[PDB]
């Protein structure tokens, strides 16, 4: 009944497995019955507000409803309001560049309901000089977020109370998520005995960035998969 | 609630210009008006005429554009750099990024003719 | 993009026959192919100069004595820029590693007081003698010897008088040196000058306060000398860099006092008392006000009818009336509306 | 030994730290820097610096010059450098050596030699 | 007197920071050799550089640098800290605090462990151990 | 066409001074998967002084040009275009090269020879 | 995520190690905040104890992947290597101590009056606006709300094993600090079960287009060699 | 165990010189059996002394003053920190590595003229035309 | 109640020995409890360095995938297998509630049927005039449920929560902390 | 812990200049160069790790196909200054050579295990 009789567990026996069994199953058919559940409830949402939703994607489980900027806040106030959603709780908001668009900027929203354990997600558009209405009305922890949003891109939110810069250095010229920023940006900093002070300079790198990017396939990788609509929200053939 | 912060703005896209040429008039004024707490803030060598010389200079470079979409961007930076200023969020390090010129003579050699730039690579 | 402000072109040639090709923009990660040593780099003016030639990818050689007071110096290079070498005068091989691989030797290497192991004329003709040994030996293309204003061979003060013999000597060894005088410098931290005067208990005169001469800016004098560095037309020339405006003493403490809005104290003593004090004085191990430094104080600054300036140099000097409050601030001592105002806020509350 | 600077002066260095290895006097190859060299574009970093210290790693070339050539019977040496010492793989992936053309034939990855026989 | 009285200030930036800690911890126990740790600068001796410097922050650890009363050493603790490290190519990150204050020691590791920070500090102490004070005023 | 250089922060060297090439990538020679070729690129052209140069001390390439590594991608040249204005990019478009088709018929390596054959066919 | 664009499955031992090392990641992620927030309103001592612990698992995070903190050792795929050999022994030898390591931190904490004078009541965060902030985990469960993404949408093998979430009421810094207190009980409790039930097999998804091949393949086979060549390049 | 009773144990199993050479060396009072010794000169002892805690059953006696964990030849560094069961002196042949070349054990000489010095090891990418003149 | 108090002699922890131990029994304020110091015999022994089982040690497989000769790759390339995006804007929808479904078609054939789903991808139909023109029996099965309820925001796998109260909760009853499973 | 260039037991480097180290890494921390040696081998003529700039990864280590780079368990080679810690071919493989054995300590019980 002491310590120093404790019983070797390194003595044991252990479990010894002759051929370990392993099923090959493609993941993505454990969501077939919940994706088409998600395509019933966005017919839902598009039949109840024709004024607002352009569109929606459906991918695995997650439901996206692309919207114009102008339809942010009637369809987010559906969103956390109405009683079949109740998306109470914000998760995060960011934005998207897709310099080849004539409208830059795609900004997105990401929405839980916790009554209903279920998320979602909302997009529009954007450029450098349209702003998108701010949520906070509607979100208090939406502020910082579209902070982050203006800070990273540019993308203005019409109607927040305090945008400013929250990540990048006081007086930073730029928004660095951008496409044609540079990885490394412009400026540089160092300590100046002449002025003893902090100086910013232009960059110069002791070995340049290597870009490897160059190596990337001649071919095609993929491929172009398989669809896993649900035979309801495909068109008819004609006999 | 999430509450704003000293001499925060909400921002608003002017849909007429001449409703944004009083906003941002009002906006040089408030930098004028600062600049001896800037100076006291930031530790400057330099005087406050100086301040407001640059304010103007600053104000000065915009002073062409035409499309309203650009000037509302422009109008909401400006007052981001002047709350900035005002709440001594800057060090005086970024603070004095605006002010190259007050700096002391580089040195000797700065090229202005094709010969000059060419004898330092840079034609 | 940076610029090399220093350099006229990007192909230079030394007058040792070495081909120097500056690469890059100038900044931090540039090189222009330089390299020099400057003796005395630790110093008031050494660090200046060093942070200079260190900015635009210079190689600089730094001889020290100490290690810690030399660290702060390794901030002004990129990898590789500043190199530190131990050296002593007492030790000519080590002279001689300093100075081996540059194109450039600069001597800033001087004391205004003496020493139990240097003397004025072991710390200014031995030492100078030895370094323009090394450089003549080694046939380097610059040499750069800074000296003092009122350097005089048969002077009353034994600073001027090993100056000016230092600056014989070297002119004999090496006939292509360039020397330079500065007037007195006043800066940031300065020594015997500005913070002297904004924090001493008590400025003591011995000549009224009467002495003048030309104070120029520290930092004026360590670009002239890197303008000099670089072009090879001041090759065995006499410079002599000195301010804008001539001062007395007493009006410098004028201008120091109103800038500080503290009154500075000064006392006039007989020059026989001041002097008997400073000898005294110098028996502790700390630097002190020296007997040659009182005995200087009689002494105006004397410029060379025909010598060089700042103008040959294409360079300005700044104005200390200017730079005073700048360079004086951290020792600053610091209604009817108000009041009016003030009725209108709470002062105590729960 | 006596190496002249950039400057005109001299540079003395022990003859034993010009050799580019302890094992070998000369490069192996044509980029790459001489002992020489490194000293005249370097030595202001190399000046109160001991050299008996710096790294002095042996020369492989040399070394694998000194195994002793493989024997084999038919057409197809094979080699892999493997550890039969230790568990795991702990040599080079396991290539196949034509030997038929005359002489020795260097293994591309470990550089041992096969030969025919 | 100043390697059995080794107090550092902490400039706990990053992950660099968490090592840190594990130093101070029972297993390492570094107040045994007589290390503390002081919120002021004004009370230490030793900055600890521990995690990335961004150029936001570069000011700030200027201004803490210049505060230390003297005699006064840093260590530069990480590869963020020593070059940049992970963060090397970013539009917001110092490559080495060397570029913003004088460094006395060089720790690698992203982080290095509670041992090389130890080891770090033991090669401090052997360069304060080898310090000329009075024998370099004698040698004036 | 929006003056979006304005808003966006970069450096006026670079809307000044900079030229940018537009182009698609080659089908490179040594493979023959043409995945790389569709898109657009976009990148900039090398300044002479500030492109590379060898360190001195451990013999890394430096470099003073921040766009260096840099490059865009567009899903075709009028967007490239019309992104490259937008930022007051003077621009170069390379147009694309394809491969002129043919008719390759495997029989014709065996077809009748009338006269004196004109080489000998190896397979 | 990038197992979920890839449209892979981590095999079953992988899936085991994920959720017993993101256990004893929680406990780490739990000492460190709870003793630190004890530190910070004056407790000094829960730190030193609790840093202990710390020591021990970290212990185990250098044993599987050769660092203490940034081990890089779960991977798109799986994880990067296989359990050595003692290592479920030496786990469960911490776990028959762990217990009484919690009991004596609760001791200096839970009914002390002075560390209750610092808590309740403060910080306070209703459910409501709990949601509307966008705050999550502990940060939501004390205001009462019970959601756990472990229960409400499992993963690697959350689903596979027994434990309790705890649920504050009042949403305050001492509820939340008793839900971070029964969290350490919760996964001393998984990690028991992970060190029983842990299965054999493969560790990394068996598909070399997405991990890297073994070593003795990738130095004897072809089609192994090119796709480790690929997948490094 | 941090006891009275345990130190004059093992200052009395270890004996006075040694006590004084290990209380001006690691502070504690070691008693254990020499397990092997470095080419260095250092000294390591493993002790079962069962008032020992995990990971202070081997321990490294130093050759010189200023000592240094630098010092501590390579194998003997793995054995100290619980790496391997069985000392270097102890390991087989087989579990040796085979060399061509002399081993050679050299610590840390950073803070010294011994220094590691880097240095490019390639010439420079471009070489330079050697001027010729030739007559017209 | 597992999980519950298990004695000292059971843990993997040093302790105390002979007199020391009935010293220790009688002062402790929980004598269960360990002392943290773990067993040196028995911890970490062997050494991860010196493990005979890394001589036995190879690289694990499962069946199927590992064998020799049945499993072509190209099926269990579930990387390439991947779920495409369903993108539908509001002219598909138009036309799902137009024309029915693959599932449940509502269309003609011939050109008829193609000249439907042509003139509805063309824009001649909206959608608010297609969902006007639904009828009942349209709206209750496929755009609200066959109640005439709007559908709830789906859940993947739903959690049915339990309150455990009583001896095998986590706190005692005063606590402000439950537990639920 | 510190990198290492490995050789073979006839004391051939193991390093062909595959590359993939450089690839792989991270950080970017090592910079390659190679050519044709004299006897007609693949072999680097630069090898560099800048130390600073390194993560400690272990990613050249496993994306290596002839255990050439390695790390060891070392710890303890704190510098007092930074151009120490820019490893060049020489400063590497002297580390290999230098703990060797330590190495196959750590290879021959984590061999079977990559
Ligand atoms: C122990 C005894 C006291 C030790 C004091 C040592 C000392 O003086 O250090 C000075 C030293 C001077 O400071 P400094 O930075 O050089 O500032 C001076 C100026 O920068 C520029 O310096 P300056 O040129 O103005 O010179 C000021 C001068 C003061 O000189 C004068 O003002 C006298 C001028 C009259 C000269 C003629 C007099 C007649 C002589 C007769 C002939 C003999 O002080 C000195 O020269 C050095 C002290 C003399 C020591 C020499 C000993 C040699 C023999 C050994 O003090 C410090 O280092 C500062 C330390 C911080 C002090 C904090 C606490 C201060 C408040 C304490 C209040 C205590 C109240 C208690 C009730
Ligand atoms: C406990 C030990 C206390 C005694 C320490 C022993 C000190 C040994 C000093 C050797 C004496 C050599 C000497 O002549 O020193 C004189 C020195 C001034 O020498 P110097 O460097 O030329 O200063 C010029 C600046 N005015 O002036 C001094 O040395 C002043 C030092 C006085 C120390 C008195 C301590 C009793
Ligand atoms: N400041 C002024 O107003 C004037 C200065 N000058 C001259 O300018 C030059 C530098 O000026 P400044 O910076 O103000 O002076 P500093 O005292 O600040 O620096 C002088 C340098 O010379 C070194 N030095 C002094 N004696 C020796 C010695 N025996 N051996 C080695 N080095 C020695 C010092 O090294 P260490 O730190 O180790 O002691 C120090 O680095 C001097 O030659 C000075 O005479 C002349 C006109 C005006
Ligand atoms: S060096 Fe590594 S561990 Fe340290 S702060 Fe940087 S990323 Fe974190
Ligand atoms: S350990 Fe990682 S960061 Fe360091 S050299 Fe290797 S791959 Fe690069
Ligand atoms: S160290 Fe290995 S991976 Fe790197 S280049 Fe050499 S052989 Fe290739
Ligand atoms: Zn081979």
Excluded at chain 1, 88 to 114: G, H, Q
Excluded at chain 8, 57 to 77: A, F, I, L
């Amino acid at each position: 009944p002491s310590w120093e009789n404790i019983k070797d567990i390194r003595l044991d026996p252990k479990v010894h497995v002759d051929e370990v069994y392993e099923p090959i199953v493609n993941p993505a058919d454990r969501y077939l019955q919940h994706v088409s559940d998600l395509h019933q409830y966005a017919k839902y949402i598009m039949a109840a507000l024709p004024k607002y939703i352009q569109g929606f994607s459906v991918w695995k489980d997650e439901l996206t409803l692309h919207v114009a900027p102008s339809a942010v806040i009637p369809v987010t106030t559906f969103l956390r309001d109405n009683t079949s959603t109740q998306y109470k709780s914000i998760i995060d908001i960011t934005a998207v560049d897709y310099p080849s668009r004539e409208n830059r900027f795609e900004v997105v929203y990401n929405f839980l309901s916790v009554r209903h354990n279920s998320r979602i997600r909302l997009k529009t558009y954007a450029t450098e000089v349209t702003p998108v209405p701010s949520i906070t009305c509607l979100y208090e922890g939406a502020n910082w977020f579209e902070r982050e949003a203006y800070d990273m891109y540019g993308v203005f939110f019409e109607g927040h109370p305090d945008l400013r810069r929250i990540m990048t250095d006081y007086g930073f010229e730029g928004h660095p998520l951008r496409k044609d920023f540079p990885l490394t940006g412009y400026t540089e900093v160092r300590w100046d005995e002449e002025k003893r002070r902090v100086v910013y300079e232009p960059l110069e790198l002791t070995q340049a960035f290597r870009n490897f990017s160059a190596g990337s396939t001649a071919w095609e990788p993929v491929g172009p998969g398989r669809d896993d609509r649900p035979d309801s929200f495909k068109l008819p053939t004609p006999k | 609630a999430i509450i704003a912060t000293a001499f925060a703005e909400t921002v608003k896209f002017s849909g007429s210009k001449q409703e944004l040429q009083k906003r941002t008039l009002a906006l040089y004024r408030q930098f004028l008006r600062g600049a001896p707490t800037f100076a006291d803030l930031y530790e400057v060598q330099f005087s406050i005429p100086t301040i407001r010389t640059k304010i103007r200079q600053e104000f000065e470079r915009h002073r062409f554009v035409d499309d309203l979409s650009i000037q509302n961007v422009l109008y909401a930076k400006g007052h981001m750099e002047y709350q900035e200023c005002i709440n001594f969020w800057k060090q005086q390090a970024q603070f004095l990024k605006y002010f190259p010129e007050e700096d002391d003579i580089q040195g000797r050699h700065q090229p202005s003719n094709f010969v000059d730039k060419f004898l330092k690579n840079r034609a | 993009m940076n610029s090399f402000e220093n350099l006229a072109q990007d192909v230079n040639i030394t007058r040792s026959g070495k081909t120097l090709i500056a690469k890059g923009t100038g900044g931090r990660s540039s090189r222009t192919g330089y390299t020099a040593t400057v003796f005395g780099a630790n110093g008031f003016l050494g660090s200046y100069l060093t942070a200079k030639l260190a900015k635009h990818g210079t190689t600089v050689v730094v001889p020290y004595r100490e290690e810690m007071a030399k660290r702060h110096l390794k901030v002004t290079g990129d990898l590789g820029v500043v190199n530190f070498l131990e050296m002593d005068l007492r030790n000519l091989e080590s002279i001689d590693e300093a100075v081996r691989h540059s194109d450039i030797v600069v001597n800033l290497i001087g004391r205004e007081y003496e020493t139990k192991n240097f003397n004025y004329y072991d710390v200014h003709v031995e030492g100078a003698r030895r370094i323009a040994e090394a450089v003549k030996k080694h046939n380097i293309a610059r040499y750069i010897h800074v000296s003092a204003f009122n350097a005089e061979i048969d002077s009353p003060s034994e600073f001027n008088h090993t100056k000016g013999l230092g600056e014989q000597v070297t002119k004999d060894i090496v006939p292509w040196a360039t020397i330079v005088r500065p007037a007195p410098m006043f800066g940031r931290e300065d020594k015997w000058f500005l913070d002297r005067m904004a924090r001493s208990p008590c400025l003591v005169s011995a000549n009224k306060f009467q002495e003048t001469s030309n104070p120029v800016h520290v930092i004026d004098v360590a670009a002239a000398l890197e303008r000099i560095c670089f072009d090879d037309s001041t090759v065995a020339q006499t410079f002599e860099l000195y301010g804008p405006q001539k001062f007395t003493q007493k009006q410098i403490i004028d201008m120091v006092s109103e800038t500080l809005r503290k009154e500075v104290r000064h006392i006039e003593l007989p020059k026989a008392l001041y002097q008997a004090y400073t000898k005294a004085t110098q028996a502790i191990w700390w630097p002190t006000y020296s007997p040659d430094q009182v005995e200087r104080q009689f002494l105006s600054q004397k410029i060379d009818p025909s010598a060089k300036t700042f103008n040959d140099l294409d360079l300005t000097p700044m104005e200390l009336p200017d730079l005073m409050f700048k360079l004086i601030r951290p020792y600053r001592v610091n209604v009817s509306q108000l009041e009016n105002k003030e009725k209108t806020f709470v002062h105590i509350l729960d | 030994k006596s190496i002249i600077s950039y400057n005109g002066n001299t540079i003395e260095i022990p003859e034993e730290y010009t050799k580019q290895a302890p094992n070998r006097d000369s490069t192996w190859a044509p980029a790459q820097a001489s002992k020489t060299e490194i000293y005249k574009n370097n030595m202001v970093r190399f000046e109160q610096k001991d050299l008996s210290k710096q790294p002095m790693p042996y020369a492989g070339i040399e070394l694998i010059a000194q195994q002793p050539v493989r024997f084999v019977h038919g057409n197809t040496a094979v080699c892999d450098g493997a550890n039969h010492n230790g568990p795991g793989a702990q040599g080079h992936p396991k290539i196949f050596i034509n030997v038929d053309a005359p002489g020795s034939h260097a293994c591309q990855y470990c550089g041992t030699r096969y030969e025919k026989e | 007197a100043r390697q059995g009285s080794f107090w550092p200030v902490t400039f706990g930036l990053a992950c660099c920071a968490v090592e840190m800690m594990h130093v101070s911890a029972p297993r390492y126990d570094q107040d045994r050799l007589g290390i503390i740790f002081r919120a002021s600068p004004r009370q230490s001796d030793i900055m600890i550089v521990a995690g990335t410097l961004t150029n936001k922050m570069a000011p700030v650890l200027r201004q803490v640098y210049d505060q230390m009363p003297e005699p006064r050493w840093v260590i530069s603790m990480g590869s963020c800290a020593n070059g940049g490290g992970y963060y090397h190519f970013s539009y917001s990150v110092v490559r080495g605090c060397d570029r913003i204050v004088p460094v006395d020691v060089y720790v690698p590791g992203c982080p290095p462990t509670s041992e090389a920070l130890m080891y770090g500090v033991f090669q401090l102490q052997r360069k304060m151990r080898n310090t000329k004070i009075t024998r370099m005023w004698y040698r004036k | 066409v929006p003056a979006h250089e304005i808003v966006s922060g970069a450096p006026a060297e670079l809307s000044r001074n900079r030229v940018v090439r537009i182009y698609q990538q080659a089908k490179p020679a040594t493979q023959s998967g043409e995945y790389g070729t569709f898109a657009w690129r976009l990148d900039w052209d090398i300044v002479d002084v500030a492109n590379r140069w060898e360190n001195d001390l451990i013999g890394w390439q430096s470099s003073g040009d921040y766009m260096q590594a840099t490059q865009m991608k567009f899903t075709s040249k009028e967007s490239a275009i019309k992104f490259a204005n937008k930022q007051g990019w003077d621009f170069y478009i390379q147009e694309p090269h394809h491969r002129k088709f043919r008719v390759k018929q495997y029989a014709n390596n065996f077809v009748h020879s009338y006269g004196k054959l004109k080489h000998i066919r190896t397979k | 995520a990038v197992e979920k664009l890839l449209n892979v499955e981590v095999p079953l031992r992988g899936k085991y190690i994920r959720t017993m090392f993101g256990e004893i990641t929680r406990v780490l992620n739990h000492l460190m905040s709870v003793c630190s927030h004890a530190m910070d309103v004056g407790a000094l001592t829960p730190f030193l104890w609790g840093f202990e612990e710390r020591e021990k698992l970290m212990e185990f995070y250098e044993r599987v992947s050769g660092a203490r903190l940034h081990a890089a050792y779960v991977r798109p795929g799986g994880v990067s290597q296989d359990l050595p050999a003692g290592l479920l022994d030496d786990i469960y030898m911490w776990a028959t101590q762990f217990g009484d390591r919690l009991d004596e931190i609760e001791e200096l904490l839970t009914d002390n009056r002075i560390w209750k004078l610092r808590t309740v009541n403060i910080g306070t965060v209703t459910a409501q606006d709990a949601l509307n902030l966008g705050l999550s985990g502990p940060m939501l469960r004390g205001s009462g709300i019970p959601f756990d993404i472990r229960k409400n949408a499992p993963y690697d093998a959350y689903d596979k094993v027994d434990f309790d979430v705890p649920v504050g009421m009042n949403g305050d810094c001492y509820d939340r600090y008793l839900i971070r207190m029964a969290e350490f009980r919760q996964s001393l409790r998984i990690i028991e079960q992970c060190c029983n039930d842990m299965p054999a097999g493969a560790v990394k998804v068996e598909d070399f287009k997405i991990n890297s091949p073994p070593r003795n393949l990738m130095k004897e086979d072809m089609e192994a060699l090119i796709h480790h060549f690929l997948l490094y390049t | 165990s941090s006891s009275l009773y345990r130190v004059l144990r093992n200052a009395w199993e270890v004996g006075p010189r040694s006590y004084w050479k290990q209380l001006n060396s690691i502070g504690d009072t070691k008693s254990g059996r020499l397990v092997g010794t470095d080419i260095y000169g250092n000294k390591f002892y493993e002790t079962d002394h069962q008032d020992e805690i995990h990971l202070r059953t081997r321990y490294v006696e130093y050759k010189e003053k200023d000592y240094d964990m630098s010092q501590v030849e390579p194998g003997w560094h793995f054995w100290l920190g619980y790496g391997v069961d069985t000392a270097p002196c102890n390991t087989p042949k087989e579990k040796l590595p085979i060399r061509a070349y002399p081993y050679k054990f050299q610590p840390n000489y950073t803070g010294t003229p011994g220094a590691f010095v880097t240095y490019n090891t390639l010439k420079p990418k471009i070489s330079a035309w050697e001027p010729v003149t030739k007559q017209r | 109640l597992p999980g519950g108090p298990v004695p000292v002699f059971k843990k993997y922890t040093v302790g105390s020995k002979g007199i020391w131990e009935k010293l220790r029994v009688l002062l402790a304020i929980a004598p269960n409890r360990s002392t943290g110091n773990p067993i040196v015999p028995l911890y970490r022994v062997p050494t991860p360095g010196s493990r005979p089982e890394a001589n036995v040690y190879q690289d694990p497989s499962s069946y199927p995938t590992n064998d020799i000769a049945e499993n072509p790759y190209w099926k269990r390339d579930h990387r390439r297998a991947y779920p495409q995006t369903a993108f539908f804007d509001q002219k598909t929808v138009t036309g799902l509630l137009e024309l029915g479904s693959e599932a449940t078609p509502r269309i003609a054939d011939g050109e008829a049927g193609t000249k439907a789903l042509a003139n509805i991808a063309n824009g001649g139909v909206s959608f608010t005039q297609a969902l006007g023109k639904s009828s009942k029996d349209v709206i209750y099965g496929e755009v609200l449920t066959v109640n005439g309820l709007p559908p709830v925001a789906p859940t993947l796998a739903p959690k049915q929560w339990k309150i455990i109260e009583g001896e095998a909760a986590i706190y005692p009853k005063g606590y402000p902390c439950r537990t639920f499973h | 812990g510190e990198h290492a260039l490995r050789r073979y037991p006839s004391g051939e480097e193991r390093c062909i200049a595959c590359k993939l180290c450089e690839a792989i890494c991270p950080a970017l921390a090592i910079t390659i160069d190679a050519e044709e040696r004299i006897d007609g081998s693949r072999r680097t003529t630069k090898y560099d790790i800048d130390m600073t700039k390194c993560i400690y990864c272990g990613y050249c280590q496993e994306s290596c196909p002839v255990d050439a780079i390695v790390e060891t368990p070392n710890v303890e080679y704190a510098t007092e200054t930074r151009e120490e810690l820019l490893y060049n071919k020489e400063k590497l493989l002297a580390n290999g050579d230098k703990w060797e054995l330590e190495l196959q300590y750590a290879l021959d019980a984590d061999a079977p295990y990559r």
